[PDB]
Amino acid sequence: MSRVQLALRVPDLEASIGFYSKLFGTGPAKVRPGYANFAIAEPPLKLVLIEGAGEDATRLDHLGVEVEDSAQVGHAARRLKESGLATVEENQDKVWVTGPGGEPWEVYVV
């Protein structure tokens, strides 16, 4: 029904492509220069690797929940809005919210 996105800013992108390839025993679903991503069935996960200006070690760029269709995005938007969370809308079709310590979540569609 839905799935976690984990987006890492890494210092060596090739290295990492290799690594997570072995860690999950699968290959990247898309590779572009300066970014690659993985659709992992088990564990269910969308791993985005973004490559970053050689600044020391990997940082967590952002987090997210990947859902199945546009309705669910809308629905969550309503739900987080009513629970009281600062929502920001990015235009079809995603919604951002932010943890107290600043970590950003994006609820979106594939």
From Swiss-Prot:
- EC number(s) on record? 1.13.11.-
Q: Which residues form the signal peptide?
A: none
Q: Which residues bind roxarsone (III)?
A: 61
- Residues reported to bind Fe(2+): 5, 62, 106
Q: What is the effect of changing residue 94 to R?
A: Nearly inactive. No change in iron affinity
The Swiss-Prot or TrEMBL record lists the needed cofactor(s) as: Fe(2+)
* GO biological process terms held by the UniProt record: response to cadmium ion
Highest taxon, organism lineage: Bacteria
Q: Name one GO molecular function term.
A: metal ion binding
Q: Which reaction does it catalyse?
A: methylarsonous acid + AH2 + O2 = arsenite + methanol + A + H(+); roxarsone (III) + AH2 + O2 = 4-hydroxy-3-nitrocyclohexa-2,5-dien-1-one + arsenite + A + H(+); nitarsone (III) + AH2 + O2 = 4-nitrocyclohexa-2,5-dien-1-one + arsenite + A + H(+); 4-aminophenylarsonous acid + AH2 + O2 = 4-aminocyclohexa-2,5-dien-1-one + arsenite + A
Q: Does the keyword Metal-binding apply?
A: yes
Q: Which UniProt keywords apply?
A: Dioxygenase, Iron, Metal-binding, Oxidoreductase
Record field: temperature dependence: Exhibits robust catalytic activity from 37 to 55 degrees Celsius.
Subunit-structure text: Monomer.
What is recorded about the domains?
Answer: The thiolates of the vicinal cysteine pair (Cys95-Cys96) directly coordinate the arsenic atom of the organoarsenical substrate.
The protein's job, in short, is: Nonheme iron-dependent dioxygenase that can break carbon-arsenic bonds, playing a role in the detoxification of environmental organoarsenical compounds. Catalyzes the oxygen-dependent demethylation of highly toxic methylarsonous acid (MAs(III)) to arsenite, which can then be exported out of the cell. Can also cleave the C-As bond in several trivalent aromatic arsenicals, including roxarsone (III), nitarsone (III) and (4-aminophenyl)arsonous acid.
Q: What else is noted?
A: Organoarsenicals are used as herbicides, pesticides, antimicrobial growth promoters, and chemical warfare agents. Arsenic is the most widespread environmental toxin and is classified as a Group 1 human carcinogen.
Protein name per its UniProtKB record:
Trivalent organoarsenical cleaving enzyme
Q: Which gene encodes it?
A: arsI
Relative to the complete UniProt sequence, the shown stretch is 1 to 118 of 151
